[PDB]
């Protein structure tokens, strides 16, 4: 596992899969037709120069509406170079309308998770026969960091958040498709590395459905005999034995954190500009590759207040010393130059205004009658964007468990006046999702004032990811392996202090007051230790611990750097764990509001 859970191999394997499949289709020149929602994924695996070398493809086209008259131009190019479509129907269930339409007016590659045990298309039957289907096996490859894997399941071609679809009536099936996609992606990683999953912890109602479905699709595949052979034969490092944590969390467990203003260097760049599937900013672009840009690795998670001063050290270090590094040092200086100037000028600054104002809610300092002037001053005096208020208004409701009826209809009315009648449906979807409610399949939602959370989990004392606030997602993960956070604020009943394995004992009562139910957290154990694990472990012993953290619904870039800090703080305290943050996309405050409607 240590030599097999190497994420860099995933990226190279997927690149080899496309190239191997591409050549066998044809040997003459080819024109690739790439779906717009998958294009940044390919450019993450391989560049244009690399692709043309081992494969005959020379031009890449998009499935947008522009490829209708250009399709006829491509039709002339079709004679010169073969046309091979590239579509992704895993989370859309429907082919791109432009592709099917263009077929009747003038070879398809469909992405698929790596097969598990063996090793939708009737729509095009109306068009014609002799259709060729070459599957492209895919695995979640690292894109932003070595220990971070994204499946890009949160968004389909319309760019609607599958966790928060704009059409509210479809959340019973849009949500459940995402879970089915997570299990298939997780099976791809589990079987490739031949890992054996030990005790599993899940928080939130939707998380349980992902663990149970994963157990069903793993139990139906492997048996006890099939389990003994895998662990013992495959090295198992002969040190401790078997351990595979599968902490599974969903976004609704911690909705406050996406509404906060990010501060990490890769968070601010994600906050101001939208990263895409390939983690490349559209307006100004460079190779945001951790493998290539060695400086990018050391700066992508520091507090933005440190990127500037620490770039002086990096700049002067090359003075005593390279040409490739020479462009890198100035490129990140320019990024720290472009970003820094935008901070104090755009919205009359207000970047420090929002940051200090967020705290005034996170300790309950902002009192009831002050909402009138605070919200009004932002919209008018500072000319701040609508989303930066609608995100801040949602923060008010969550950190006080509700809003008084005097202000709830005030804020709703004020938003209608300042931004039209469309906000009476944006503010309606927020209320149903629990982001902005009042006193007056039942998914989990926060049900407590953030004053209690700040007191209990010490979220407001390591506070570099956000505006001086530890995300509640870190505390939930930390409270399993480390009860020291609770023992100073919520104590006298903690069973232990430090546990190698994730434990949920004597914490179900805490969730009952928190999420409104005591059964939100469940630890359904898998193959039970010395009964099957240590018996297999000690067998090969005589004759670190990967701790996958699945993020259902997207992880903010501030919650990625806060696990790395969490992994380090656990390492010094005895519980040495490696955290692999499997997720399904990047989620921010601006991404949410563009999806809630």
């Amino acid at each position: 596992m240590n030599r097999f859970w190497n994420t860099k191999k995933f990226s190279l394997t997927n690149a080899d899969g496309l190239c191997a499949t591409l050549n066998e289709i044809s040997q003459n020149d080819e024109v690739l037709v790439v779906q717009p929602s998958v294009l940044p994924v390919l450019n993450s695996l391989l560049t244009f120069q690399d692709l043309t070398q081992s494969t005959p493809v020379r031009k890449i086209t998009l499935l947008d509406d522009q490829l209708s008259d250009d399709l006829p131009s491509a039709l002339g190019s079709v004679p010169q170079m073969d046309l091979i479509f590239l579509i992704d129907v895993r989370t859309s269930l429907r082919l791109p309308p432009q592709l099917l339409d263009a077929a009747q007016k003038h070879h398809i590659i469909y992405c698929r998770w790596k097969p598990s045990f063996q090793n939708i298309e009737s729509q095009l039957k109306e068009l014609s026969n002799e259709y060729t289907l070459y599957p492209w096996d895919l695995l979640p490859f690292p894109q932003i960091d070595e220990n971070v894997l994204l499946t890009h399941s949160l968004y389909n071609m319309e760019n609607v958040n599958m966790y928060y679809p704009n059409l509210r009536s479809l959340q019973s099936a849009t949500e459940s498709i995402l879970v089915d996609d997570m299990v298939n992606s997780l099976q791809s990683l589990i079987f490739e590395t031949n890992s054996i999953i030990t005790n599993v912890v899940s928080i939130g109602n939707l998380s349980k459905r992902c663990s149970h479905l994963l157990k069903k699709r793993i139990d139906e595949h492997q048996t006890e005999n099939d389990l003994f052979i895998k662990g013992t034969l495959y090295g198992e490092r002969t040190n401790c034995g078997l351990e595979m944590d599968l902490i599974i969390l969903e976004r609704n467990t911690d909705p406050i954190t996406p509404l906060l203003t990010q501060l990490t260097y890769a968070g601010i760049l994600d906050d101001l500009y939208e990263f895409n599937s390939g983690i490349k900013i559209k307006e100004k672009d460079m190779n945001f590759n951790y493998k290539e840009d060695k400086i990018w690795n050391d700066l992508k998670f520091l507090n933005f207040g440190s990127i500037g001063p620490q770039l002086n050290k990096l700049a002067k270090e090359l003075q005593t010393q390279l040409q490739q590094r020479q462009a890198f040092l100035k490129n990140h200086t320019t990024l720290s130059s472009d970003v820094l100037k935008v901070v104090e000028t755009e919205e009359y600054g207000s970047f420090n205004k929002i940051l200090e104002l967020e705290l005034e809610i996170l300790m309950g300092n902002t009192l009831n009658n002050d909402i009138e002037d605070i919200i009004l001053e932002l919209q008018y005096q500072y000319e701040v964007d609508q989303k930066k208020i609608l995100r801040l208004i949602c923060l008010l409701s969550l950190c006080k468990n509700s809003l008084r009826e005097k202000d709830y209809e005030y804020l709703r009315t004020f938003m209608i006046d300042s931004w039209g009648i469309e906000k009476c449906f944006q503010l309606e979807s927020l209320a149903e999702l629990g982001f902005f409610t009042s006193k007056t399949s039942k998914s989990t939602r926060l049900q407590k004032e953030y004053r209690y959370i700040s007191q209990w989990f010490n979220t407001v004392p390591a506070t570099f990811a956000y505006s001086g606030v530890v995300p509640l997602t870190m505390r939930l993960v930390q409270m399993l392996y480390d009860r020291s956070i609770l023992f100073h604020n919520y104590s006298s009943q903690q069973p232990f202090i430090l546990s190698r394995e994730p434990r949920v004992s004597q914490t179900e009562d805490l969730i009952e007051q928190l999420y409104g139910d005591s059964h939100a957290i469940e630890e359904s154990i898998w193959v039970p230790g010395t009964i099957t694990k240590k018996i297999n472990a000690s067998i090969k012993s005589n004759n670190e611990d990967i701790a996958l953290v699945v993020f259902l619904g997207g992880v903010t870039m501030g919650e990625i750097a806060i696990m790395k800090h969490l992994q380090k703080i656990l390492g010094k305290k005895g519980i040495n764990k490696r955290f692999i943050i499997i997720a399904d996309g990047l989620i921010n405050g601006t991404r949410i509001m563009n999806s809630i409607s």
Binding site: R90, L93, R94, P97, I120, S122, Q123, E158, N166, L167, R168, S169, L170, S172, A173, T174, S176, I177, D180, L213, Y348, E372, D373, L376, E377, Y380, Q381, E383, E409, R412, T413, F414, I416, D417, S418, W419, G420, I421, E422, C424, F425, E428, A431, T440, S597
Partner: protein, 733 residues
């Protein structure tokens, strides 16, 4: 020593053994008979009886009166009786439910069948060459002028490729794949042919006895001028040619020598197997096999091969144990271990088999640690264990035949006569699982195709009860069982049989093709494979009607809007669906999305107001209509400003429309907006202050200063393009 006789021609030994025992000892032997591999079919008056080699009556095809003359009958490859009539050919497919499948000539009005032998058939009047490639006479050779002159029905033969046909003067030939003449010898007076499995052609003259076995023309391999005309010139596998003088079978060989195998009783019929010459007598059946090199070394008299002295060494372990360890060291104990193993399989008697395997296992462990894999020994034991289990069931197979036809061949030959339990043990004994599936599904196929009046309730138990005992997977293939139930018309348990499959894709597909679509859809929810369910629905929509889909969706897919998500791009279908389903809040957002997609919300806005007025079963609905009723006053009042100020006001919010009034400059209309629309005192100040500071040094705020705390007057001036003239507000605070 078993080498009692073990006669040799020139260098190789030949042996005779006893295979089974017959229980006729009557005219049945004289009566016509045929053999394939296990069974013998004799016609006793109008009662054709099929006996195995151990005298067990398996089946009995009484002639259905006659209805057609029965000249001959054989077995092709699978022990299926091929009763041949002057008019047509009637193969046999079942013995308890006798289901003779008659295959007629295409034109049974001019010619007639003259002879049939292993497929290829030959007409009578116009001597054509046909072939049974199924339920038809697939023609192979076309007639011509002077094609052939077979003196008697015993003037031709064929096995799989050559269709050698004996002319009067020449010896012609045909091949199945092409059907062409390949004339061998210009001069010939030959009267018989017994082409073997490999292709070694035989001949005979019967005027001067001139047995002249060949392999190809222009070459002679043997020309023994035997004395008396024989009775049955059979074949000894692939090697030699025998005869049958009275009770005297002589295995002829090279260079004019023969070995005589006298028999107590007369010789009736001879079947040329792959590696034997099964000889039938009135009492028991014999087997003129050929001695392999393994047994020719171990059991030869006065032998000195490594195989022989290992057996001697084992035979001295009983009392001369310190005198039998030295013999092992003398020779090469690698040929001896393998010779015993490869010779124990050949032997039939269990006693020699147990000693030979004892001898090999005795010397097997006197080798290096990894000298050779023991799998050769275990495989030999398993092969011998099976070939002795078949003998208990009446099927006698040598090692060659049990591998020429695999375990499927044995199972097939037993499934014909409804012996399913025996096939169960054989499959278990071989430690196979794929054949175990093929056994069960055939049993379930016949039971459904058998008793037609058996009620569904007890019948479903019978299939389920026997399935539970048998532990196997991927080969049960209940969809084949479901299809058989469907063909019989008992579709009630067809679903029930479909519901007991471990393959989700097959269970859903079979249930769909059975047209129990309501049940098929519901079960697909349990699997929770949303990829599969959405594939069923699009296929379901291909043959159902537009309304019938909706009727199914409402009843069974109420709280599961998956199909709607499949067509979210088609607002047309979702529109009429939601009203007919009588969902009104959900319908509003579809109307809403059209407004935002086409950038026109007013064109839909009053219609949305209508929909929220048809539910009333909520509290947020009363709030939304109020924000809509208040919007109605906002919109109608916009035309009032356009009817008295000649300014466009459409698609402007309350916030934006009040700013426009400050830019132009009004007194009461801005105040009319505030008091009528319930605009707070605070918001009025910032909105005009923001607007005024853009009005290029308006200076009216001093005339306006007469509840923002007097502070933000500075910031609008200070933090914008009005840094100058900020002093008046400095002392104003």
């Amino acid at each position: 020593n078993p080498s009692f006789d073990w006669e040799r021609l020139k260098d190789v030994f030949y042996r005779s053994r006893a295979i089974g025992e017959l229980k006729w000892p009557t005219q049945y032997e004289e009566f016509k008979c045929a053999l394939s591999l296990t069974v013998i079919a004799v016609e006793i008056q109008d009662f054709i009886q099929v006996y195995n080699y151990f005298g067990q009556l398996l089946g009995k095809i009484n002639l259905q009166r006659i209805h057609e003359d029965i000249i001959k009958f054989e077995f092709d490859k699978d022990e299926k009786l091929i009763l041949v009539t002057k008019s047509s050919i009637k193969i046999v497919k079942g013995w308890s439910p006798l289901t003779i499948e008659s295959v007629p000539l295409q034109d049974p009005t001019i010619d007639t069948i003259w002879d049939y032998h292993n497929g290829i058939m030959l007409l009578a009047k116009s001597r054509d060459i046909y072939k049974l490639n199924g339920n038809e006479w697939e023609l192979l050779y076309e007639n011509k002028d002077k094609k052939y002159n077979l003196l008697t029905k015993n003037h031709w033969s064929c096995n799989d490729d050559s269709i050698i046909l004996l002319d009067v003067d020449h010896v012609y030939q045909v091949s199945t794949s092409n059907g062409a003449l390949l004339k061998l010898i210009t001069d010939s007076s030959w009267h018989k042919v017994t082409i073997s499995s490999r292709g070694f052609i035989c001949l005979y003259n019967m005027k001067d006895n001139k047995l002249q076995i060949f392999r190809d023309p222009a070459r002679i391999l043997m020309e023994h001028n035997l004395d008396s005309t024989p009775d049955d010139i059979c074949w000894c596998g692939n090697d030699t040619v025998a005869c049958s003088f009275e009770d005297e079978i002589k295995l002829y060989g090279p260079d004019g020598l023969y070995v005589t195998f006298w028999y107590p009783f007369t010789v009736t019929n001879l079947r040329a197997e792959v590696d034997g010459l099964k000889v039938i007598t009135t009492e028991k059946i014999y087997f003129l096999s050929r001695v392999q090199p393994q047994t020719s070394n171990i059991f030869r008299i006065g032998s000195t091969e490594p195989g022989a002295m290992l057996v001697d060494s084992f035979s001295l372990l009983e009392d001369h144990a310190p005198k039998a360890i030295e013999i092992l060291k003398n020779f090469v104990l690698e040929k001896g271990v393998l010779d015993c193993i490869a010779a124990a399989i050949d032997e039939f008697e269990p006693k020699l088999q147990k000693m030979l395997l004892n001898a090999a296992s005795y010397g097997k462990a006197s080798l290096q640690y990894k000298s050779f894999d023991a799998s050769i020994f275990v495989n030999a034991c398993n092969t011998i264990k099976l070939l002795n289990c078949f003998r208990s069931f009446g099927i006698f197979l040598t090692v060659e035949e049990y591998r020429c036809i695999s375990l499927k061949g044995v199972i097939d030959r037993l499934l014909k006569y409804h012996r399913y339990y025996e096939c169960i043990q054989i499959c278990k004994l071989a430690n196979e699982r794929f054949l175990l599936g093929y056994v069960f599904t055939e049993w379930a196929k016949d039971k459904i195709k058998g008793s037609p009046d058996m009620e569904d309730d007890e019948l479903l138990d019978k299939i389920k009860s026997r399935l539970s005992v048998i532990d196997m997977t991927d080969t049960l293939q209940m969809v084949a069982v479901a299809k058989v139930a469907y063909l019989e018309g008992r579709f009630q348990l067809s679903r029930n049989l479909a519901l007991l499959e471990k393959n989700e894709e097959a269970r859903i597909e079979q249930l769909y093709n059975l047209d129990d679509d309501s049940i098929a859809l519901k079960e697909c929810i349990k699997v929770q494979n949303y990829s599969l369910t959405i594939s069923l629905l699009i296929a379901l929509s291909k043959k159902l009607t537009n309304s019938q889909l909706t009727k199914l969706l409402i009843i069974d897919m109420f709280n599961n809007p998956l199909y709607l998500y499949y067509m979210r791009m088609d607002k047309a279908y979702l529109y009429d669906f939601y009203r007919q389903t009588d969902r009104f809040i959900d319908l509003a957002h579809v109307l809403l999305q059209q407004g935002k997609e086409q950038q026109s919300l007013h064109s839909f806005l009053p219609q949305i107001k209508d929909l929220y007025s048809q539910v009333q079963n909520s509290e947020v609905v009363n709030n939304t209509i109020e924000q809509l009723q208040r919007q109605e006053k906002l919109w109608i009042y916009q035309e009032s400003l356009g009817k008295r100020f000649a300014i466009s006001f459409t698609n402007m919010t309350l916030d934006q429309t009040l700013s426009k009034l400050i830019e132009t400059g009004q007194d009461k209309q801005v105040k009319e907006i505030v008091k009528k629309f319930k605009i707070s005192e605070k918001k009025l100040y910032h909105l005009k202050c923001k607007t005024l500071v853009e009005a290029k040094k308006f200076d009216e705020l001093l005339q306006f200063a007469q509840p923002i705390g007097y502070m933000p007057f500075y910031t609008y001036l200070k933090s914008r393009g009005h840094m100058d003239k900020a002093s008046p507000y400095v002392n104003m605070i």
